[PDB]
Design a protein around this nucleic acid. Structure first.
Ligand SMILES: Nc1ncnc2c1ncn2[C@@H]1O[C@H](COP(=O)(O)OP(=O)(O)OP(=O)(O)O)[C@@H](O)[C@H]1O
Ligand SMILES: Nc1ncnc2c1ncn2[C@@H]1O[C@H](COP(=O)(O)OP(=O)(O)OP(=O)(O)O)[C@@H](O)[C@H]1O
Ligand SMILES: Nc1ncnc2c1ncn2[C@@H]1O[C@H](COP(=O)(O)OP(=O)(O)OP(=O)(O)O)[C@@H](O)[C@H]1O
Ligand SMILES: Nc1ncnc2c1ncn2[C@@H]1O[C@H](COP(=O)(O)OP(=O)(O)OP(=O)(O)O)[C@@H](O)[C@H]1O
Ligand SMILES: Nc1ncnc2c1ncn2[C@@H]1O[C@H](COP(=O)(O)OP(=O)(O)OP(=O)(O)O)[C@@H](O)[C@H]1O
Lengths: 362, 362, 362, 362, 362
DNA sequence: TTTTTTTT
């Protein structure tokens, strides 16, 4: 005859929600009967229909409470506490294990009985992506190994090119894949003091196509970032600890995470060059767009920005044993359906419709 | 007995109120008898007279409680929470369809028994507005589609032309028809990052005054607008989610909305030009001013500015199937109602007067 | 026994008070017996002596309470809430009608039994100010109409002229009449952003001595205001709902009020001038100064710059039907009073003394 | 039947937790059945499996409670209170003796049944560090006693050597062993004071990379460092208290702690030279870079940066009497353990392997 | 039973503790039995062992409070309130008498039977300082009287002479004796406004090492602070009250405190020279330098820095009558104690050794 | 937390 605060907490755990208003807004829906709830009937959203019928009576009494935001705040605190625990006890390999499970859990629905997606679209996706550079699957598996291990110095690859050279949209799917974020390294000095606080608890950090002053001799806007890598001595090795701030109040001490440098094709000297111990580059190879613009759903669905395509790329082109061991059955359970549905010729079809700039579908 | 907090929550939901002071003011009105209420007799506000009798009982107890702003805070939090659920979960088309239901429910009132305006004059508004630029109902439908599918790069159009060319009059009606928001461009980014924060969930946003180059002949300056938009070279398209600031609440990393930029005439970099998947050209038509000069209620009652007038245009022009798929019974009902009083000959009699710069009314 | 919170709230409505400290200070005074209250017996302040005897009974029990500031806080919210509902729902005619009722209430008090100033003196002010310009009375009415209708791009009047042309003297009386506020755009361009925020929910605004540049050719200092108004163009014509700022607060979004600009004879780009309705150029005249010299009681009582003096003039110069229907009864009452109080020989003697540069009384 | 706040307070004390979320999260884990607990079974995290049983019943009741965060804030404040009492009351020698127990605890975990570490690899790092400077153990012992006594003027050590000559490494190891912080002083002269706000209540500081001037004749980029130090004699002499700029807060007043200075081979004023107790020169050596080049696990596991290696070195070389009388017991235990785990030939060969520049292990 | 908040407030008063965490931490220690308390047994900390037995019974119940930080805040605010009362009422003479009573209590502990110090080593310091300036004891007594009478214009003292002439040593001893703060006026003109806020409610201030202009002709590095002191006239003169500010606070108005100024041999404008009462020249004395190294326990223990040392000099040299009346009783007992410990021959032997340049103890 | 501070 009172609200059970624990049931709300369990719902917050099961959803892994951490926004007090989202939690409140969704949980109130359960006060009407699940039996008539159009959302329950039409199978619209997992985070509703999976739970409505369970939480129903408590949601009704919840709708009569007077403390509603208070309950919700404690629930949000539970999930933030859980995250804080995990972020300090575990190591990067378990983190990755879980993060992949999450993506796989999603694919398990998207292409599942909802019919809400056909994976073939993403197959055309991976086919485009694979042609970005040789064995992109292997380039990624190698990058994964690196920034899992977070070994000293071996912590920063690079992407070069001119502008409009894919290195941003590539980084997007990798930032997605990791839970990383990026740097406006060109900022002015006191802004530059406190951009850095983004790095708090981040898996990776990325340099946003850093700019050389006088690069306008190459029509490159002559921003500050490459000079600023002079001051940024040690963060790329990450072998001494630092403090961090977002201005005035948001502060903590940590090691500076690894990640990826990128630049447009300014010059770079040894003192800065070696700081990103590894390098790669890409450039516009317009037929690839000619496929996309004849495969437009790839971009309408921004698939070439999404990390789930990278996971799918890795799934087919990585041997099942290469994975973390515990999950590896799920890898088989997906490998099965790629084995079922695709000949490697049909994989190649897409990759070379791509390589022609021809629309993959035919 | 006691104040039902639930009943207040309902009234806030019903009204979709989200300012705590407005809500408190509204609810306290009901504490007198609805039986005698002048505002009810006057039929002055729907948000009052529809509800006064229903809530009178609970308003009586509400008036005595020593805790009133706590009730109203929780109610306002409920409405904010509702908006946040939808922010994530709705299709863009459903969002737009809700916006239309709201507008149509006002047109019920204005042109209803309240007599508070006459759609005669608003359809003269349609006549005036349809004279602005060709096929205007059709051009609007193209903009709506581009915004609903929200496809990469296919996200922004530019309005360009001299002063008193209505480019902003049009932009204003489009913001209303969506519920969009507006932004400046002529600042250093540091503060403007917070102004951009207004976008933190908006279907549509608009920028004005590129402050482009050239212009010294046109009586126009160059400055930070054109400096800034090209500097964040993708951000307007927003291929990638990016962090965004609001006071007290978290900084939000999200896709930036689609919409419009408008300018008096300057050069446009081909880079920036390529983000504008359309540009549309505006000019004076002094006879339209003369029609307005002979049709001044078109500005006094702000009809020429209203998204309502664009919605009216789309009603009396577009075929019923082009709409969203649930609401079409509304669309049919208004199309029928219109020619209970209009004939296309009289609708052209307005277009007649308009094109001559003659006053619409006879 | 117990404090009645509603009786406190009624007094805040009755007084239209909205500072917590002012409200608290007022109500505490009711604790002593009105039966002896020296303020009552001297009839000093109406907001006291009108109410003391009613509120005394509740004030005694309030005087003991431990909650006091919270009782006051809820009341101040109730008044601020009433203002928001009103500002969102009344027409500008009704708002202005309310303003006149408040001013007329003060006038009844001033010339009541306390009688603390003489109507003879205030009419010298009326004579003095109708003297200041041709058809002064009618120009005032024309401004009020414009503020009431708030016709877009017909929203601002320019007062231009040297120092001691009286433009602030006129503008101050206009501002007291409509209850606007004053702003200073002669600022660093960012400071405008908080500064212009004071217009939130105001009826009218004035900008003071908006500086151009190069005016030292005619001994004027040079400055920013004009160029800042060029930046502010959107706010001026009242096209669309811009938004406004406060410390520790989210923005509020609305049309920006109509208003006055005062200026020395800088140059103006007609691009800007074209956006006024109308202008008045102010031209100093000797006899006014001699008149004031011998009429010192005018300035000490601040008469010539008070909106009370303007209201008196309209009661004199205008026909009854020009005012709104509700107040016309009070208008008739005030016209009736004046006609007992004066003869045109008296008022003509005043204007003759003013023309003759005498002290106004003889 | 009710939550014991005292039991949470014990846990917070025993685990020395000072983050309310870390505390909240881990305590919540205890609600699930201890008898089955996989974390306990896998003996994974000491802070769990040592405690889960004792706290279980109270943790279950805590899971219901409506007030969880308040309990945790009280608990955390109790821990912070302990740090303040200890900070103000202990001798420097006791503070060090605490840090030793804290690290020895962690070693008992690592090389215990948890098996998370291999003591042989850790002994390999000790040899490489020991070869970095002659008589390294006695150098380190001298340094520690110097910090413990903190005899004024006799307070600072100077590390000179070319880049990639290890001076950053050794500083980092020392700083981890003692818990100080580090400072940049190539800043311009003003905000040095805000920088020095860092030092408040720290045990050590390190001045990294102090730029001289004219060193650019040897490509050493010139800057503010040296001449900033030549001001600061009083801070370095440690003779009397100084004041430090915390941002947003008042200055606070204390003895400025001892520390380490590092540089490439800039020239130094005699005035500054005289403040150091002792200079250590560092030089790059081929066999070391070659040995590191082979012995990858050292760097992957960041062995040579970590203070655990220094403690192992002290234990391996130095008599029990040299350690604080209390913890000598743990020293004796660790001596016996290490002796059993390493016959001298093992260590001697490993050190000889370092000398060859081959991998340390054969 | 329930917590006595009164007993906490008494403890906070008697320890004069005004840090909430320190108060909390100290009180918590008492919760264990005083009978066995090792801190009591070893008499390590007076604020514990004097109090543990008294407060024990309440410490237990406090340890069960769910309200602990509130009890502490109320107690701590009682300590803060008493200081505001005192500063706004006490005579400067009584302030000094309080300050001596505090110092005399430390000396009772410090040379107490458990104390670490010995009176002989400290008296060696007194002999050395009496050599530092002719008539040293009288100079101190003159300075103290001047601070107590605080006579306008007749307020400020100048210490002048080359680096390593002991002026900071003497200043620090004086500053401990009286209480006060350092300040640094070498800043640029604006930040001074916060610097000077440090003076708020202080008894003394000391201006560190003000730098002049052109002294590099004598190697003296130039700076702003001399010219700033030109423009601090009313602060120095103390004739009228002034306004002071901190961060994040509104200005505070008071008489600016008296104090000391320290500098190298820059030339002083005759104007500023006129504001000082007294100039004292400090010059190097190599025979002190030779002595000091032979007497290093003075530096090691910071004896020559301390107000404690000065008070021994005063107690030695000056008549009992000269001290403030109440503490004369305590003072007599210290003179008696000192006379027991040293015959004048001991003192003579020491002081002779200093003058010889010989270790102060033969 | 933002605003003032911090910064420039
Ligand atoms: N290999 C490629 N084939 C086809 N198009 C490409 C290729 N590389 C880049 N492009 C074009 O570049 C566009 C933008 O790429 P991206 O956002 O990654 O740029 P970027 O190199 O990171 O640029 P910037 O340095 O300016 O931020 C893509 O949408 C695509 O049109
Ligand atoms: N196509 C048009 N032909 C003639 N007059 C027009 C036209 N469109 C707008 N007007 C006139 O322009 C006046 C101002 O319109 P509006 O503010 O929309 O102009 P704008 O050119 O879009 O402005 P801005 O310079 O701010 O971009 C209207 O009141 C109307 O009289
Ligand atoms: N038209 C006038 N002719 C002569 N004297 C005037 C006139 N108007 C005002 N005065 C005198 O000048 C004084 C100042 O008037 P007011 O401040 O309104 O003038 P202003 O032109 O608006 O000045 P400013 O630009 O300095 O604000 C009045 O108090 C009165 O004494
Ligand atoms: N004595 C040495 N001989 C050769 N290589 C060395 C030596 N000491 C360190 N190294 C290499 O130099 C790298 C960096 O070491 P470290 O940062 O301690 O040097 P540093 O002289 O302080 O450098 P810097 O002044 O550039 O920061 C080490 O990780 C190791 O690879
Ligand atoms: N009269 C003196 N003659 C020689 N050496 C002295 C003398 N007085 C002090 N010293 C030495 O100078 C050291 C520093 O003393 P102190 O800080 O008081 O000097 P200072 O001249 O006031 O310095 P600063 O101006 O740098 O603050 C002392 O510890 C002592 O070793």
């Amino acid at each position: 005859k009172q609200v059970s605060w624990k049931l709300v907490t369990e719902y917050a755990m099961e959803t892994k929600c951490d926004d007090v208003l989202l939690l409140l807004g969704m949980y109130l829906e359960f006060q009407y009967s699940f039996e008539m709830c159009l959302k329950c009937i039409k199978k619209e959203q997992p985070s509703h229909y999976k739970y409505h019928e369970k939480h129903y009576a408590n949601a009704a009494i919840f709708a009569d409470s007077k403390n509603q935001k208070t309950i919700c705040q404690q629930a949000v605190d539970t999930v933030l506490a859980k995250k804080r625990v995990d972020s300090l006890q575990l190591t990067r390999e378990q983190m990755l294990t879980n993060r992949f499970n999450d993506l796989l859990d999603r694919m398990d629905i998207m292409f599942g009985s909802t019919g809400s997606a056909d994976i073939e679209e993403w197959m055309a996706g991976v086919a485009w992506l694979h042609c970005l550079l040789p064995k992109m699957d292997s380039v990624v598996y190698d990058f994964l190994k690196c920034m899992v291990y977070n070994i000293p110095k071996k912590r920063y690859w690079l992407f070069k090119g001119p502008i409009d050279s894919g290195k941003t949209t590539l980084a997007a799917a990798l930032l997605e894949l990791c839970g990383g974020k990026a740097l406006n390294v060109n900022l002015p000095l006191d802004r530059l003091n406190f951009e850095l606080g983004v790095a708090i608890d981040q898996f990776l950090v990325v340099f946003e196509d850093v700019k050389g002053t006088g690069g306008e001799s190459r029509d490159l806007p002559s921003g500050q970032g490459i000079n600023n890598l002079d001051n940024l001595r040690d963060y790329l090795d990450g072998s001494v600890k630092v403090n961090l701030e977002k201005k005035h109040l948001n502060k903590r001490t940590q090691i500076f995470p690894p990640g990826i440098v990128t630049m447009n094709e300014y010059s770079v000297p040894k003192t800065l060059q070696a700081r990103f111990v590894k390098q790669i580059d890409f450039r516009p190879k317009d037929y690839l767009k000619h496929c996309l613009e004849r495969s437009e759903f790839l971009l309408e669905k921004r698939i070439i920005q999404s990390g789930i395509a990278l996971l799918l790329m890795l799934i087919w082109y990585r041997p099942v044993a290469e994975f973390a061991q515990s999950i590896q059955s799920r890898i088989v359970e997906w490998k099965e359906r790629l084995d079922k549905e695709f000949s490697l010729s049909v994989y190649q079809k897409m990759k070379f419709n791509v390589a022609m700039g021809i629309g993959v579908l035919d």
